[PDB]
């Protein structure tokens, strides 16, 4: 359990390093999660792996510029609620999950400009920023500048496929980071659209990985549903913990008629590169009040 790499296991006496080197890059990331509100009580957590191998195939194989990935995940999760003229009912539930989650080929062509990404995927993998995995997918990713490039796909559900298309802008404005996105999607009749922006809008003197910064995003979903979402986050306010943030946001999500509002503050605790720990309080409503925390290692 080392604490500067990106890795929990550490390198495993240099046969990871090496694995590398032969083109394997085998990862572990674990998301773990508790959370409960504050007449009814009521409590949730979950653990989640995600084993993902990555290789490298034109330094395994021969095959110039591609790449393969594969990626299982389990997740499982045990939930509680006790509910209270006159009446008792609480209810218990345990339950686990197995997904192929990610089995494809990516080759890049044009000495980068073009992305080529077959296989086994979701739409969620390269369009937007449980939940959905094509049988078969494509993307087709061309990278215009280096902070720009447009992107096009193709994806499962036999007698349709889902066509994204979605432009990315990552400008330097005022040399801070930003990052555009508009996004179009249609069935072949399903629909939709989205943007996101987010900008870092202060360095903390002048620290550019220390700062405010601001996000939006806004999603599409006819058949029609709408997803907003607002925030903020400062990573590193106080220099005593310097890769911690502290995040606030609001999000409207909307089914047309049931909406439903949620509001979220969290503090992510940086304690080492491969582990983050993040307490989080909620407020949701159509209504309550929800203690949380998350956190994430990679082995």
């Not at 078969?136 to 500048?145: C, E, F, G, S």
């Not at 659209?193 to 700062?211: C, E, L």
């Not at 058949?223 to 995040?247: E, S």
């Not at 080492?272 to 209504?287: A, E, G, H, M």
Request: no cysteine.
């Amino acid at each position: 359990f080392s604490s500067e790499s990106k890795w929990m296991t550490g390198d495993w006496g240099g046969t990871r390093t090496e694995l590398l080197d032969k083109g394997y890059d085998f990862t572990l990331d674990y998301v773990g999660e508790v959370a409960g509100n504050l007449d009814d009580k009521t409590a949730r957590y979950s653990d989640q792996f995600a084993l993902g191998a990555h290789l490298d195939l034109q330094k395994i194989l021969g095959w110039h510029d591609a790449e393969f990935k594969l990626a299982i995940t389990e997740r499982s999760g045990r939930n509680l609620s006790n509910d209270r003229f006159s009446s008792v009912q609480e209810v218990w539930g345990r339950g686990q999950t197995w997904r192929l989650t990610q089995m494809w080929i990516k080759q890049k062509y044009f000495d980068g400009a073009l992305d080529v990404k077959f296989g086994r995927f979701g739409e969620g993998e390269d369009f937007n920023s449980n939940w959905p995995v094509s049988q078969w997918a494509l993307r087709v990713k061309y990278n215009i500048t280096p902070a720009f490039f447009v992107q096009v796909g193709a994806f499962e559900q036999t007698k349709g496929a889902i066509m994204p298309m979605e432009a990315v802008w990552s400008p330097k404005v005022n040399g801070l980071p930003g990052e555009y996105r508009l996004g179009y999607y249609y069935s072949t009749s399903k629909h939709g659209w989205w943007v996101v922006a987010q900008q870092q809008v202060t360095a903390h003197g002048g620290d550019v990985n220390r700062g405010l910064s601001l996000f939006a995003n806004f999603t599409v979903h006819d058949k029609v549903d709408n997803y907003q979402q607002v925030g903020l986050v400062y990573k590193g306010a106080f220099d005593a913990r310097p890769k911690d943030d502290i995040g606030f946001g609001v999000a409207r999500i909307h089914v047309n008629q049931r909406t439903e509002y949620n509001a979220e503050l969290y503090y992510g605790f940086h304690v080492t590169n491969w582990l983050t720990v993040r307490p989080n309080l909620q407020y949701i409503k159509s209504n309550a009040l929800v203690a949380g925390m998350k956190m994430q290692s990679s082995f």
